Symmetry: D2
Subunit: 120 residues, 4 copies
């Protein structure tokens, strides 16, 4: 089985720490991105999400409120376990930037992927 | 200022109800989707997310844990206020399906948009 | 049957003109975007794509090579015919920006939607 | 400099062959996917796209008309060269499925990534 609780890194070098997942699958944590619009100002940012509880390889989602910009990122994906018991989070994300008014909305959303593995 | 608290409907007919937004911008609520893979199964499902607090037109994200499938959806977007004071949520979403193993991961994520306005 | 040949406009005000669709479903045309990173620079830009041929409501894709930037956009979607014979193209797109090197790749892709209807 | 001409594989084991890129950056090719909705019926499928010509690390897009389903995929990305002269295509894609009518459009588009390297 695949809890999101613990410490993770991704293919870009970011790290995230997730606290205990509650009975509803809800979790909180802290995200340190290796990458931003401007790296010189990166600070720790809170995350909040929900995973499925019963599934051995659950799907999940979470939101990161960036504490150093007006942007928000959401991640969704699935936790997989291989034959050796090794976990990987396979995720896709959307990064929403703040734009001035609705006529700029079209350009406000970036998309990408991330693969996370457990630290230690 | 744009607070996500309240009831909203989107362009597909779905309805969501967001409760109080806390000091950190965290919020919970429920989501009744008009659409699903198997609509006969649809039930009210919980959401959890974070919005920015200081901005008049905040970005935000939330996760919906579907209570009737193994899937998860994340939404991110921005709340805009027009010159008449009307609020629109412009969002993009990712819908993560559960797949049996990692070899099927490539096909597990759908993408789309939704525009939300207030029920009343 | 839905042939992409003709002039179309989208929900952002952009206009495109598609030429004859060949036996394979290949088509070329031009795209005049209403929106860009630097709108002062916008010029008419070429597109090239393929639609399915046998289907009444074909899926399709096309690439727009922006003639005024280093970016590229791809659109994919489906042409629907409603009960009155009116055609709508429902599309999603990815806009790829040029970045200086691979360390910036993560932020180079935007996503969005567009709905197109015929000019006349 | 980064021509798309040649033979490529991606992280899912798919292979594609691209013919000579013309003076406008247009190219044709053939795509053999390792993965589909149903693999037992996979056949070679044509692709058609445009790359930028002047840039050393050009952006590009192309469309794959699947010859064994009603779907279409578009890819966009950038060709990067490292210090050793090794090329990688970093791409994102949208896979459009055919749905019966416009009320099902919401679920019709999958998103993902692929990294391609040159064969040989």
């Amino acid at each position: 089985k695949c809890s999101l609780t613990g410490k993770w890194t991704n293919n870009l070098g970011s790290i995230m720490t997730i606290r205990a997942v509650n009975s509803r699958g809800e979790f909180t944590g802290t995200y340190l991105t290796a990458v931003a619009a401007n790296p010189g100002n990166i600070t720790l940012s809170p995350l909040l999400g929900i995973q499925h509880k019963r599934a051995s390889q659950p799907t999940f989602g979470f939101t990161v409120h960036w504490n150093f910009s007006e942007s928000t990122t959401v991640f969704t994906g699935q936790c997989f376990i291989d034959r050796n018991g090794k976990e990987v989070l396979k995720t896709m994300w959307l990064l929403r930037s703040s734009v001035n008014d609705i006529s700029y909305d079209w350009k406000a959303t970036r998309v990408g992927y991330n693969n996370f593995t457990r630290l230690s």
